[PDB]
């Protein structure tokens, strides 16, 4: 009784007229399926394939998003943490100044925090502004008899902009601290952006191919069994593992997906390990008090040579915890694409009393074919589909173009060089 | 589809040890983070533990730091929990959940199996009547008292499933002695006290105490 | 506490309440109707603002109720009066907070009857 | 060490209304907040995670928006299968904490409670203990107050109450209070009365009985 399909099709929601009791005899399904049912069942067959794959790898999209939101929130907090800590130490020792000149540190980090969150891309002039704002106020402390009305309404570019080769008031501290601050803001940024792509990459990469060549005769896999015979013959592994590979042999991100998690860990280690953050959290205060000491004993040369013109939330999780917590989440992601076919053929299919044989392309006959191929050279011997001459598809092949430059952008940033 | 089934006994005295299994099917158990969340007879949900997908990181709540231990088996696809030397406060309904990827979100929960800690023993219930109090004063109501039993499940019925309308079966209440007790009332016309007959047969499964009782009015 | 005279059946009008003047923006005042020849029956319940408004089944959709937190005065709007809604309407505040339904202090009210 | 809170504890609304459930946290949580729906005695569902994002399968009528320490959960048009208990969660600290649930009940016209009393059984008196029962049948809202009068004396600690869930044919509740006493303590007095105070009642009504009919 083909009406066994009728109730099963009623669960899927078909208008059960002209399908219950009648069977007659770039295409599909060589049957108790009507003409318009076929054209509408392949569309129904494709739907689960998308929803199954996207839900299968859905946790990579959520993990990279969760680590992003918790790493991005971490860096912003430690910027605000160090801003408040630098004010405490400098107010204790010196009761002569800084009593009402802590307003510069607010404008210092705020422009630093714009380089981190891409709000701006100007840091070399940003630091020169800060050193100048300190330069035009410490300078008169050892020159108290003199008073200075600045030139025009702005002293200069930013008073002694050091351009054109001024004998630096703070000798080497501006260059040294710039090198230490620059390597930090760019390393913590290429890491966050790298995670930001990873979410976007896998999110759109999970949107599954339409591949009409794969879609047509995909119905043969699981759909057309319902059309002719009873639906109790859920397909076994042999047939399944090749149609899901042949339809997905394009998205072979495996060569470019491995180096990505490598660069994520490599940059994380240099960033987790000191010299990239917690050192430059206190290095600012050390070099500032060191540069002023150079000034104190080298002001005789510079001041004499400058007679001319004007002269509540939960505290940031420890980065070490945030790194091995990051490391564990990523361990289950490296060999993900190779293990993707097993999960897809390991859900609705009970392959894991009745029998072992299952449905095949043209009957219930026994199957013993091969089923490992995963790239164009490997899937050129495709028994059940027609993979493209070069496996990678036109939009995907553009996900190994702008979505692996971050790896080199994270690797180079881990060295100190950027752009 | 995505299924999380829990098993294990739930009636032990203080000091008894229980282990629960969270058999998982419908998805690859090795990818996701698992966790245990318990629901007491109270309203709130209490978190007790959670374990990484590989099993490298294990977290326990502050109230279960010493006597609690969680394990994992990615081959058999089963999540365990070792409950040792539980105090009376551990009495709750224990769920197992899966982390969808985002930190500490649980999209798929288990059906639930409850654990109870009590020093009482298995005892059958005593059935007592609540005779109706009463020309025709509205529609009188009668009842059926069930007192002093253990453990929890006991089913009250009237007339072997023939009469079920207007019947209210109240939830059991744990009294000072440690034994549950409940009552089931029925609203009937004041003229049916002599024509028809009502029998509230009460069955306590864990004690094999099927008791049939009649409520005759005076 | 309002009077305009007797009204025709099906006509609509509003009332108000004031018996004890004290701070009362949190406890919720009530509204009854009692006709001599029958005990007091329920009309509407003016629960504390944002805890919703509940009416008796006899006046569902007709009579309305609203209150003010700073004015500390509660009113009842009456619409579509049937020729059998004639009674004196009294208001009473619930003393407790847990909505225990305890109307300790009652008021006189003001009826109007129907023509 | 971190505290979560919700508001209100119980909200009454009709089918088709607009409902907003507010959750409040002690400390700041940028976007780490989850919402769950739990029907009586069954497993909870995941509604809204990451403050504002919806879970696959959840209808479009569910909405949640929050940033900081104040969060909301909005139902645009209430459908009959939304009556359940909604829970708040935390996704930041090591000891993740849930908030006590908000029970979303059906709204109904006010119904005064039907009061009854039942005498202790002559077969129960043989064991030396006598439990007197007081029945409140079919009423709404659920909030009510029951006091026990033994010869017009207030009681406390000897009475235990249990309330039913919401009925499906009239959306009403029912409550029962059991006064437990020993036989010797039961013989001293002659009048036992429970008086019910409900918003639908003009005055606290009473039901009493005497020993020996």
Tab-separated table of C-alpha atoms in Angstrom, chain A residues 55-56 58-59 62-63 65-67 69-70 321 324-325 328-329 332 336 339 342-343 346-348, chain B residues 1 26-28 30-33 50 52-57 59 98-104 108:
chain	number	residue	atom	x	y	z
A	55	UNK	CA	23.367	23.824	12.843
A	56	UNK	CA	26.160	21.229	12.684
A	58	UNK	CA	26.843	26.515	14.443
A	59	UNK	CA	29.044	26.462	17.555
A	62	UNK	CA	29.089	31.276	18.478
A	63	UNK	CA	32.467	30.438	20.031
A	65	UNK	CA	31.738	35.475	18.631
A	66	UNK	CA	31.821	34.776	22.378
A	67	UNK	CA	35.621	34.933	22.563
A	69	UNK	CA	33.094	39.913	22.689
A	70	UNK	CA	35.014	38.787	25.789
A	321	UNK	CA	42.893	32.254	31.921
A	324	UNK	CA	43.964	28.590	27.675
A	325	UNK	CA	40.196	29.059	27.740
A	328	UNK	CA	40.649	24.753	24.530
A	329	UNK	CA	37.771	26.180	22.479
A	332	UNK	CA	37.966	21.115	18.706
A	336	UNK	CA	36.445	20.300	11.770
A	339	UNK	CA	34.892	15.558	10.391
A	342	UNK	CA	30.560	12.069	9.421
A	343	UNK	CA	28.214	14.276	11.453
A	346	UNK	CA	25.315	10.665	11.525
A	347	UNK	CA	22.043	12.369	12.445
A	348	UNK	CA	18.852	11.588	10.521
B	1	UNK	CA	15.944	14.731	17.442
B	26	UNK	CA	21.392	13.246	17.723
B	27	UNK	CA	24.687	15.167	17.680
B	28	UNK	CA	28.424	14.679	18.102
B	30	UNK	CA	32.684	15.585	21.518
B	31	UNK	CA	32.225	19.128	20.169
B	32	UNK	CA	30.088	20.850	22.810
B	33	UNK	CA	30.562	21.849	26.434
B	50	UNK	CA	30.141	22.080	33.823
B	52	UNK	CA	34.838	21.100	28.683
B	53	UNK	CA	34.374	19.158	25.456
B	54	UNK	CA	37.805	17.549	25.786
B	55	UNK	CA	37.414	17.294	29.564
B	56	UNK	CA	40.454	19.437	30.348
B	57	UNK	CA	38.632	22.089	32.420
B	59	UNK	CA	34.213	23.691	37.295
B	98	UNK	CA	24.662	21.469	26.298
B	99	UNK	CA	26.500	24.732	25.654
B	100	UNK	CA	25.710	26.006	22.156
B	101	UNK	CA	29.153	27.635	21.906
B	102	UNK	CA	28.439	31.017	23.438
B	103	UNK	CA	29.669	31.158	27.034
B	104	UNK	CA	27.133	29.635	29.462
B	108	UNK	CA	19.087	21.823	24.811
